[PDB]
Amino acid sequence: SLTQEQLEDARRLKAIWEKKKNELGLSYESVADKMGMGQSAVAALFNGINALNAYNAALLAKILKVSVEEFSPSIAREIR
Amino acid sequence: SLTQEQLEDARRLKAIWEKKKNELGLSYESVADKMGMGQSAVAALFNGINALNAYNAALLAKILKVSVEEFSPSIAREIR
């Protein structure tokens, strides 16, 4: 089970994805491919089924062209 | 024109960027946004085209999770 804060991280992440995927030219398929992971594995992060870690948070921040803190202030402090 | 020390600051900064950008989840775009500037201006600082100042050096050090002196000993003194 995810903590409340991990569910809030995922909600912020999914909202950034939904806001930016068109301008980034990305799809449900192509962002998983960019992350070298399965489609449902990435959806799992966005939808709050699996929690983020520092590896995944960093890779998604780079792909989405945002700061980690915009979806996970806690991972962003600790990656720090 | 940059002095040799200013060019070394940039060089040392670029080396830290190359070392830490992936693990920290950094992109030119996310850095540019934090720095209130464009992506080419960020690159110009890394590439020794424009010189660092105290504000940009402090913010880049925070972003890269390093002390300023790791790339600019002279500007670190100015901040002190």
From Swiss-Prot, chains A, B:
UniProt superkingdom: Viruses
All residue ranges annotated as the HTH cro/C1-type domain in the record: 13-71
Chain residues forming the annotated DNA-binding region: 24-43
Functional note: Acts as a transcriptional repressor that allows virus to establish and maintain latency. Prevents both the viral DNA replication and the exit programs. Clamps the two operator OL (operator left made of OL1, OL2 and OL3 sites) and OR (operator right made of OR1, OR2 and OR3 sites) together by binding to them and arranging the intervening DNA in a loop. This step allows repression of lytic pR and pL promoters by binding to OL1, OL2, OR1 and OR2 simultaneously.
Complex formation: Homooctamer. The DNA loop is maintained by octamers of repressor cI.
Note: Bacterial cells harboring a lysogenic lambda phage are immune to further infection by lambda. The cI repressor protein inhibits the lytic development of any additional infecting phage particles. The region of the genome that codes for the cI repressor protein is known as the immunity region.
Protein name: Repressor protein cI
Organism per entry: Escherichia phage lambda (Bacteriophage lambda)
Full-sequence range covered: 8 to 85 of 237
